[PDB]
Amino acid sequence: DKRGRREIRVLHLLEQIRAYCETCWEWQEAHEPGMDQDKNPMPAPVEHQICPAVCVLMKLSFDEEHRHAMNELGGLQAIAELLQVDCEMYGLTNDHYSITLRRYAGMALTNLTFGDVANKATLCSMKGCMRALVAQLKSESEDLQQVIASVLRNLSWRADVNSKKTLREVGSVKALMECALEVKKESTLKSVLSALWNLSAHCTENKADICAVDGALAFLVGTLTYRSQTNTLAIIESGGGILRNVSSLIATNEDHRQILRENNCLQTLLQHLKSHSLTIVSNACGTLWNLSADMGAVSML
């Protein structure tokens, strides 16, 4: 009864975005740039009332039963393909319609990937979408950046081998670190640093990429003494978590050490040892140990 009602409702919405996607794919894949322009104008989302469809799916995605219906009909892939094709068609634009459409799609994807092994793997297997998502981090819209960081945060958490490789390949590390440097809102920084913390533990390359970004290390040391206006330790914990993960690389690079030194990192880490947060204490111990130039006691804290 009501289940069929939910499925039909969700199905109609997905058929709508799919039909639009098929029109965009045909245009992008078969339309020869120079050939009777008037008979094949580039599709526009607004002309097909697409955002409203994505808005409904985004709202319904907060309800578990509707998420189940979406998962039975390949809803995540459909939404992802739409986000991807729109980004490829219009790139980075300051268009209010396009920004909202992408934010609604990203929010649905965050809801659909939350604690869903299958959906996370599926989204990461879509490398074109992944490149599109990462590109959105350069958007002037901080609300969009936050949505994308949240998607990347879910994907970087407990990622399988394939997902980890994709996340690295599309350059999400550099993109996230560069984004962290320009964000103005704390809520945004939290999602960005949280994602970077997950990513910084995947492999050595990710660690090297973080350190390579100009101003990154100085910025990370700065998060150690961050004064959260919302009275939280989230920034200090994630920023310090990232620092701990890349500290092993910093240890063998005098230039980087010099940067931590100039920013009085050591003194701050020693102060962190007194924290009421086990995460902060643990991060500090790990950083101090790595920088301090058989086994250590790190893996026991």
Side-chain angles (χ1 to χ4, degrees):
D1 294 299
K2 292 182 294 182
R3 183 185 181 184
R5 294 281 180 171
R6 288 191 279 87
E7 293 184 60
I8 294 178
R9 171 55 160 160
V10 170
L11 178 65
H12 286 333
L13 293 170
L14 297 177
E15 299 185 316
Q16 212 182 315
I17 61 183
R18 287 169 180 168
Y20 176 71
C21 276
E22 290 183 354
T23 300
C24 293
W25 291 328
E26 169 182 52
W27 187 84
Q28 275 203 147
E29 294 156 15
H31 164 292
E32 175 178 51
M35 194 66 270
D36 299 302
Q37 173 191 60
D38 290 63
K39 66 167 190 178
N40 13 276
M42 177 175 50
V46 68
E47 301 174 306
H48 303 273
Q49 296 72 61
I50 299 307
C51 197
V54 182
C55 180
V56 179
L57 286 166
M58 176 275 295
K59 294 175 183 174
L60 295 174
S61 74
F62 281 95
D63 176 50
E64 180 170 58
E65 289 183 302
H66 282 82
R67 281 204 292 290
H68 179 288
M70 286 177 211
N71 289 160
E72 297 302 293
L73 303 161
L76 175 135
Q77 189 188 314
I79 292 166
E81 300 180 314
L82 172 65
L83 170 54
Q84 183 192 338
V85 77
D86 187 75
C87 291
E88 299 174 330
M89 289 167 75
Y90 300 89
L92 238 58
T93 173
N94 289 312
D95 190 320
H96 194 287
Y97 190 87
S98 179
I99 292 174
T100 302
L101 171 59
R102 295 177 194 179
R103 294 197 308 94
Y104 285 173
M107 287 167 82
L109 293 180
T110 294
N111 281 355
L112 291 169
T113 53
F114 178 72
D116 194 302
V117 180
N119 282 344
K120 292 185 184 186
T122 300
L123 187 52
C124 283
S125 78
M126 305 178 247
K127 294 181 178 54
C129 188
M130 295 299 294
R131 288 202 77 184
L133 286 174
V134 171
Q136 304 316 291
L137 291 174
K138 296 181 185 181
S139 168
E140 283 179 49
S141 166
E142 259 200 58
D143 293 319
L144 179 51
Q145 285 172 152
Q146 177 167 61
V147 169
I148 278 53
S150 300
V151 169
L152 292 174
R153 169 179 170 168
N154 288 359
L155 299 184
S156 62
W157 193 60
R158 293 188 175 183
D160 60 32
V161 187
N162 292 310
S163 301
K164 295 181 180 179
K165 178 179 180 179
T166 298
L167 289 166
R168 185 201 324 120
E169 301 191 306
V170 298
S172 63
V173 176
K174 295 277 187 176
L176 282 164
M177 190 64 252
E178 282 179 53
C179 173
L181 299 175
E182 316 296 352
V183 297
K184 302 172 184 174
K185 297 177 66 174
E186 192 182 306
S187 61
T188 307
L189 185 60
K190 289 179 186 178
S191 297
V192 176
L193 295 186
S194 179
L196 276 170
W197 192 5
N198 295 333
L199 292 168
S200 65
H202 291 170
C203 65
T204 300
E205 305 82 72
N206 288 185
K207 303 180 192 299
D209 281 339
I210 290 173
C211 299
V213 173
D214 297 311
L217 292 187
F219 180 88
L220 290 175
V221 176
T223 67
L224 299 185
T225 51
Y226 182 74
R227 288 184 292 181
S228 169
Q229 286 180 54
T230 182
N231 299 302
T232 181
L233 304 176
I235 299 299
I236 294 174
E237 297 183 321
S238 58
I242 294 164
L243 189 63
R244 171 182 169 181
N245 288 343
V246 305
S247 60
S248 58
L249 280 181
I250 298 181
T252 64
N253 185 148
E254 186 54 50
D255 295 76
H256 296 165
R257 278 178 173 283
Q258 180 50 48
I259 298 172
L260 303 200
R261 194 176 297 133
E262 305 178 313
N263 290 292
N264 304 296
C265 182
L266 182 61
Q267 171 178 54
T268 297
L269 290 176
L270 291 178
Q271 190 59 29
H272 275 185
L273 295 180
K274 303 172 184 170
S275 171
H276 293 304
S277 168
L278 177 56
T279 296
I280 291 180
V281 172
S282 182
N283 282 338
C285 287
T287 306
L288 289 168
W289 177 263
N290 289 326
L291 295 179
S292 70
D294 277 42
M295 55 183 278
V298 293
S299 63
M300 316 188 284
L301 191 57

